[PDB]
Design a protein around this ligand. Structure first.
Ligand SMILES: [Mg+2]
Ligand SMILES: [Mg+2]
Ligand SMILES: [Mg+2]
Ligand SMILES: [Mg+2]
Ligand SMILES: [Mg+2]
Ligand SMILES: [Mg+2]
Ligand SMILES: [Mg+2]
Ligand SMILES: [Mg+2]
Ligand SMILES: [Mg+2]
Ligand SMILES: [Mg+2]
Ligand SMILES: [Mg+2]
Ligand SMILES: [Mg+2]
Ligand SMILES: [Mg+2]
Ligand SMILES: [Mg+2]
Length: 74
RNA sequence: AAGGGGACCAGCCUAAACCGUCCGGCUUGUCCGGGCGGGGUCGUGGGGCCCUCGGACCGAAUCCCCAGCCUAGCCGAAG
């Protein structure tokens, strides 16, 4: 069973990673402990949506630097 | 059972893509979900979206009217 880690987990994976676990481990441990969520298509895109936002919002912060950098230093 | 001969005769609505819209969620958005409306319904495959061309017939199983029919009856020849 594929799930999306919501946390870093020992020898499983880092947050946002999609890994294969036994259906039982997910159903009766991971899911009700909020440590992960099932790797369905509905929230697969919802995952990608925020990787994308985090991607954009990061590079906007870098663009602000180079604008501020080229202004000063020159 | 197919086939042949007859009785009767009729074909339709959706799901999904895509658009809209109201709400809900916090994992903040080009988000996810639930409603609702639009769209679409096919096997020669059909539909969706993007270009080019073209701009009235058909009609209900629903509703309305009516005829007819039913639920009482009546006239009816000649010792
Ligand atoms: Mg037959
Ligand atoms: Mg026959
Ligand atoms: Mg026929
Ligand atoms: Mg519809
Ligand atoms: Mg909706
Ligand atoms: Mg709909
Ligand atoms: Mg419709
Ligand atoms: Mg329609
Ligand atoms: Mg239609
Ligand atoms: Mg064919
Ligand atoms: Mg086609
Ligand atoms: Mg009809
Ligand atoms: Mg009499
Ligand atoms: Mg008499």
């Amino acid at each position: 069973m594929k799930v999306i880690l919501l946390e870093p987990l020992e020898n499983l994976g880092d947050v946002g990673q999609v890994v294969d676990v036994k259906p039982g481990y997910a159903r009766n441990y991971l899911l009700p402990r909020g440590l992960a969520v099932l790797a369905t298509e509905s929230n697969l895109k919802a995952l990608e949506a925020r990787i994308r936002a985090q991607a954009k919002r990061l590079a906007e912060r870098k663009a602000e630097a180079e604008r501020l950098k080229e202004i000063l230093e020159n």
